Symmetry: C2
Subunit: 191 residues, 2 copies
């Protein structure tokens, strides 16, 4: 089928892209080299202007890139990207310069940012690091302002997710352990 | 049916209780008064010893209790607790001393802690605040060590979730906005 239709997400609603707690892909660029890893420990931090947290282990090449550039992208992978997600979270760029081609990661650029975005995801958030030395050293905890947000309109539009009507393979992934994840499920509305 | 069977969760696996990013209930006690609120912005922070983050707005009575006592419980509500979850997140104890009875919250105590635990949840994590003045003031961001963890063995046992085999109403809730949540869904295993 046709290319996914990407639309901007009003910045004040960007937090909704992560509210259900999906496992994400973290991408970054440093000195012209791109990288992508998996992160379960990424959480919204504020609404307006949007902010988020992400925990990045000291062993990761992606953390190094973020420390050097101060910018990254958080993006929401799909069930179709199950293998990609696990692979980028099981291999380090430090061990193979061809990580991205090995993991099946296709990158693109968007909105004049000097950043890599992962093709096939449901949503993307461009992030500017707010440096916090103590948090980063003591807790591996990084805070960023979300400066731009976009999503595939078949699965997120007008400020809401539509997993129930979108193709099943666009559901978000929610990691537990090993190679095991849960896809997001059924919609419920409180009275 | 029978009472849920509660077992301790090995502390080194406690992070798995939150890995899929559920919306949680935050409970706390101060000067003998208990409170419960809803928090979507709660995320694992470390594995061993376990730690977590939670974002608590300055307007919340629960935040006050946490600041005063330095202790709280993070617990994972179920689809059966859809109304309870939305209600405790839509009403403040500051406005009605009877919040808990209004919201249908049944509390219990566990493992000699001076803490309130919410009956009917799938999992509970006892937390000790690690005070971080700047994070708490600037970002409403609270860090805690997880000192104890337990779960309903029908839905989490031997370090793994079993949503696929447990009753559907024990699935976790993943908030988006308004009264709308998604339940956790189908299990997937990477190759
Ligand atoms: C599903 C999944 C979730 C993960 N979550 C995190 C996380 O939240 N933080 C982190 O530092 N590493 C996490 N990891 C591990 C990194 O993705 C992994 O170490 C990766 O190989 C780092 O790649 P890099 O060194 O090329 O940056 C996760 C891995 C997987 C498979
Ligand atoms: C589903 C849901 C998720 C929520 N997430 C958060 C959160 O992460 N942090 C926060 O401070 N408030 C959050 N809220 C709002 C609080 O739960 C709400 O302000 C509550 O009434 C506070 O109660 P209290 O003042 O009695 O402590 C959420 C509400 C709902 C319904």
């Amino acid at each position: 089928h046709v290319d996914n239709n990407i639309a901007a997400v009003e910045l004040a609603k960007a937090y909704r892209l992560l509210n259900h707690g999906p496992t994400v892909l973290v991408s970054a660029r440093s000195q012209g080299i791109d990288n992508v890893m998996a992160a379960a420990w990424c959480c919204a931090l504020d609404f307006a202007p949007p902010k988020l947290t992400v925990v990045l282990d000291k062993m990761t090449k992606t953390r190094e890139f973020i420390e050097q550039s101060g910018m990254f992208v958080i993006q929401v992978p799909t069930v179709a990207q199950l293998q990609l997600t696990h692979r980028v979270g099981s291999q380090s760029l430090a061990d193979d310069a061809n990580k991205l081609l090995n993991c099946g990661v296709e990158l693109f650029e968007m909105a004049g940012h000097d950043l890599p975005f992962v093709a096939g995801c449901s949503a993307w958030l461009a992030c500017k690091l707010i440096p916090e030395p103590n948090n980063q050293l003591q807790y591996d905890l990084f805070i960023a302002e979300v400066i731009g947000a976009w999503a595939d309109t078949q699965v997120f539009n007008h400020g809401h997710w539509h997993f129930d009507t979108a193709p099943a393979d666009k559901r978000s992934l929610h990691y537990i352990a090993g190679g095991q994840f849960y896809a997001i499920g059924e919609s419920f509305n409180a009275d």
